[PDB]
């Protein structure tokens, strides 16, 4: 009764999202088949951001050089000031780029850590938690009630199928400072 992470990633997620983490791995030199509580972080990522934008391009999940060729493709129709590292999302209504967190240590550390990073005045942060706790820019959550319970659902979902499997414990304790 302790599982193996790799298993349920394959089997509770989307095989769209499981590619998507497994080419970002692969990208960086990481084997999904060896960093496996990194590999479900990055899977649970890619599936908030989908879950946000359903108004918004997506950005992660895309090759690098496309994501890139979108980002400034968006900046020069618009006045945006660009990106030092390439955001997960572009809101069309509110006109600015989204950094999407999913963290399983404490929001707050969390959103600083991603401000401090990519040290913008312009993008948006937007930080979800497996205990139901979010954080976004400004206290402006952009989606409404029902949208961001959706997703706090999914990740108590995704920490439920961990807890049956026995793979919670070293997943929630696993994440570090990027
Ligand atoms: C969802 C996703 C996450 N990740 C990793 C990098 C970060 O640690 C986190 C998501 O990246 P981000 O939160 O900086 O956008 O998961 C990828 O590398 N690629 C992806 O497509
Ligand atoms: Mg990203």
Not at 153 to 159: A, G, H, S
């Amino acid at each position: 009764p302790l599982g193996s992470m790799e298993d349920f990633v394959r089997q509770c997620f989307n095989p769209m999202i499981v590619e998507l983490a497994e080419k970002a791995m692969k990208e960086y030199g990481e084997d999904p088949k060896i960093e496996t509580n990194k590999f479900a972080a990055i899977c649970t990522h890619l599936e908030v951001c989908f879950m946000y934008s359903d108004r918004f391009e997506i950005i992660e999940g895309r090759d690098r050089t496309m994501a890139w060729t979108v980002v400034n493709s968006i900046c020069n129709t618009t006045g945006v000031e660009k990106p030092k590292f390439l955001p997960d999302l572009y809101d069309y209504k509110e006109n600015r780029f989204i950094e999407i967190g999913v963290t399983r240590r404490e929001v707050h550390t969390y959103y600083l850590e991603k401000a401090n990073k990519i040290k913008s005045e312009k993008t948006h942060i937007h930080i979800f938690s497996f205990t139901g706790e979010e954080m976004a820019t400004k206290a402006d959550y952009t989606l409404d009630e029902e949208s961001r319970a959706r997703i706090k659902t999914r990740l108590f979902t995704i920490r439920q199928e961990m807890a049956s499997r026995g793979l919670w414990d070293s997943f929630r304790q696993s994440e570090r400072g990027e």
